[PDB]
Design a protein around this ligand. Structure first.
Ligand SMILES: O=C(OCc1ccccc1)[C@H]1O[C@H](O)[C@H](O)[C@@H](O)[C@@H]1O
Ligand SMILES: O=C(O)[C@H]1O[C@H](O)[C@H](O)[C@@H](O)[C@@H]1O
Ligand SMILES: [Cl-]
Ligand SMILES: [Mg+2]
Length: 392
């Protein structure tokens, strides 16, 4: 592995200021140029927030539900995304602003809960979407992804729940960038995009920061206590959003795998060539230089993990998710751990993967659970306990 504490010019990093002001920028530029693609703008001038629905007694009175259209320019044809937010009414009643879990969803806001008041998504949805007809949402799709989205449990634990359909931002399909935030800004289609131009993971990540922009204006939530989380490909997005945007208070990667938390140079499970051929829209075209050539990579994913430091970072695996390379995810955490310890934070104790269902580490935390790829109640219990400790 490239040593996170040795700079690209061979300079060894021995102090927190050099990490922050020299090594971090260096790593951000390398991930942007060679891996994810460059994010071509931050907050758009002229972005508009419009609350389209609000219900103070949603979920049997447990929560206030808002839907917010976030439009990225004043042009009414500019792209937008639809933010679903649930705020726990008990917290509101104590005249307190709730901390927030924020993450993208795979198949639409209407899939995170059966709640029939959620607007069905009008956007293209992938064929794998349960109860989807002709790539469009259907009433039968309501709550179809609830397993990954314990909304009422999260609310009962004192957190707001914010989500956006990843396909509002970039449709998850090999040509999706052609109708996305990226094509709003860049008339190039397909593989005419610049080699260092962002792909779907960068667009998804950017959307998470725009959601945080909205949350900073919502009087019901505390935008300085946002945990950004994602599962699998959306966990890749959560990692890159949290690395680019240090406003996020805590980052959670649930089984994000190749190009997320897993070491690429391990060549275990999904490889760089495989991921770029199946998902040519996810990464920068420059990342294809490393197809069957991971040895030339100037970074590996322990350095993306390290870009969260010293903020709390939870990486987790599933024992039978070999395609994600669970031990490669653990070793990325261990290889990032020296940067966290530079800031006085600690990672997993000892040098090999902990027993299943036994989290290990302080602000840099890891667990592996039994079972197949997924996001389970046990995963969520561990994440909520982590947030309880780190979000005041
Ligand atoms: O398997 C897929 O593409 C395979 C492929 C086909 C033609 C050219 C290149 C690759 C897509 O399947 C779903 O649409 C997923 O949401 C999306 O991420 C995947 O790329
Ligand atoms: O998003 C998911 O569930 C996963 O889908 C595929 O398995 C892909 O190869 C993984 O990289 C991704 O993380
Ligand atoms: Cl619980
Ligand atoms: Mg792998």
């Amino acid at each position: 592995l490239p040593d996170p504490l040795v700079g690209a010019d061979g300079t060894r990093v021995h102090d927190r200021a050099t990490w922050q002001h020299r090594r971090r920028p260096e790593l951000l530029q390398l991930f942007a140029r060679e891996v994810y693609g460059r994010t071509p703008l931050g907050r758009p001038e002229g972005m508009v927030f419009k609350v389209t629905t609000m219900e103070h007694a949603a979920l049997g009175g447990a929560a206030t539900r808002k839907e917010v259209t976030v439009r990225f320019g004043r042009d009414p044809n500019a792209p937008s995304m639809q933010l679903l937010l649930y705020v726990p009414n008990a917290v509101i009643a104590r005249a307190e602003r709730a901390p927030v879990f924020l993450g993208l969803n795979f198949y639409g806001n209407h899939t995170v809960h059966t709640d029939p008041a959620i607007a069905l998504s009008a956007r293209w949805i992938p064929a794998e979407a349960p109860n989807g007809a002709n790539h469009r949402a259907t009433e039968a799709a309501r709550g179809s992804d609830a397993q990954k989205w314990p909304v009422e449990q999260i609310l009962a634990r004192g957190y707001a729940v914010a989500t956006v359909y990843c396909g509002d931002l970039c449709p998850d399909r090999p040509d999706g960038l052609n109708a996305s935030v990226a094509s709003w800004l860049d008339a190039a289609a397909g593989d005419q995009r610049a080699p260092d131009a962002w792909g779907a993971i960068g667009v998804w990540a950017w959307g998470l920061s725009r959601a945080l922009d909205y949350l900073e204006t919502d009087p019901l939530v505390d935008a300085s206590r946002v945990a950004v989380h994602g599962h699998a490909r959306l966990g890749k997005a959560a990692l890159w959003a949290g690395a680019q945007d240090d406003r996020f208070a805590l980052v959670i990667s649930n089984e994000s795998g190749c190009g997320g938390a897993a070491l690429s140079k391990r060549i275990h499970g999904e490889t760089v060539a495989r991921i770029n051929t199946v998902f040519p829209h996810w990464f920068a075209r420059n990342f294809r230089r490393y197809d069957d050539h991971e040895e030339a990579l100037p970074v590996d994913q322990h350095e993306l993990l390290a870009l969260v430091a010293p903020r709390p970072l939870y990486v987790a695996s599933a024992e039978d998710d070999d395609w994600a390379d669970p031990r490669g995810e653990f070793l990325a955490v261990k290889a990032a751990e020296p940067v966290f310890r530079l800031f006085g934070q600690t990672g997993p104790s000892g040098e090999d993967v902990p027993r299943v269902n036994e989290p290990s580490g302080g602000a840099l935390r890891y667990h592996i659970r039994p079972g197949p790829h997924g996001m389970t109640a046990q995963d969520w219990a561990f994440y909520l306990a982590f947030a309880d400790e780190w979000l005041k």
